[PDB]
Amino acid sequence: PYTIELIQPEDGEAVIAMLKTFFFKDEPLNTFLDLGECKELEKYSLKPLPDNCSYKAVNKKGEIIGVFLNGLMRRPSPDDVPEKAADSCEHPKFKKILSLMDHVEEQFNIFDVYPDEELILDGKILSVDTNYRGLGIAGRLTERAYEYMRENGINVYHVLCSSHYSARVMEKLGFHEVFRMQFADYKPQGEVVFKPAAPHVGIQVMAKEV
């Protein structure tokens, strides 16, 4: 038995504690790099919370057993000055992840796919406690966001997935691929950076129109 609830500002520490236990250790890129202590990822994860559209799954004892942290994303302004997230990161391992994210954004802009949309929901951090996996919690977290989208006239939910394994979960939930890149083809300075196990394959950006 569990609830799905809006994450409140006072939940920040508990959210970080849960992420440090699971996501920091078990998301494929993080574990491949052996991310370790990473205050930059803590900072990254707390950022979307004040957008008031991030959800926690909470067990019968009041413990957080899953989160989906989402933020609003806006179409770049006509006078936009694009910035690389990796530039302001001092943690070398997390910088590799941010650099990959920057590369994806350089190759693919979700707003090109949906010219009429000004605001899109961005699913940033998805994590479920191991002992509660395979129960559909990811789906119920995702579904709660549909409520927010309806309430705010948002049509598109965009989720960058770091493995084919998690992309498949999003497919089950009704998302489709909009961009992909194999790890074997990601060679920003001429050489492969990420070489996780073969089944991960690469990143897939997933989208659903709700």
Ligand X SMILES: CC(=O)NCCc1ccccc1
Task: Please report how close the Cβ of residue 118 comes to ligand COA at its closest, in angstroms.
Answer: 25
Residue 202 has phi, psi (to 5 degrees) of 170, -165
Stretch that binds ligand COA, among 4-12, 25-33, 80-88, 188-196 (CB under 6 A): 25-33
Strand partners, 66: 57, 128
DSSP element (H, E) containing 26: helix 23-26
Is 6 assigned to a binding site? Answer: no
Decide: is 33 part of the binding site for ligand COA (CB under 6 A). no
Task: List the single partner that 134 binds among ligand X, ligand COA, none, CB under 5 to 8 Å by kind.
Answer: ligand COA
Task: List the single partner that 123 binds among ligand COA, ligand X, none, CB under 5 to 8 Å by kind.
Answer: ligand X
Q: Give residue for tokens 């129109």.
A: 209
Decide: is 5 part of the binding site for ligand COA (CB under 6 A). no
Is 66 assigned to a binding site? Answer: no
Nearest to 154 by CA among 80, 74, 77, 78: 74
Contacts of 29 by beta carbon, 8 Å cutoff, 6+ apart: 97, 100, 162, 194, 196
Enumerate binding residues for ligand COA (CB under 6 A).
Answer: 23, 26-28, 126-128, 133-139, 161-162, 166, 169, 172
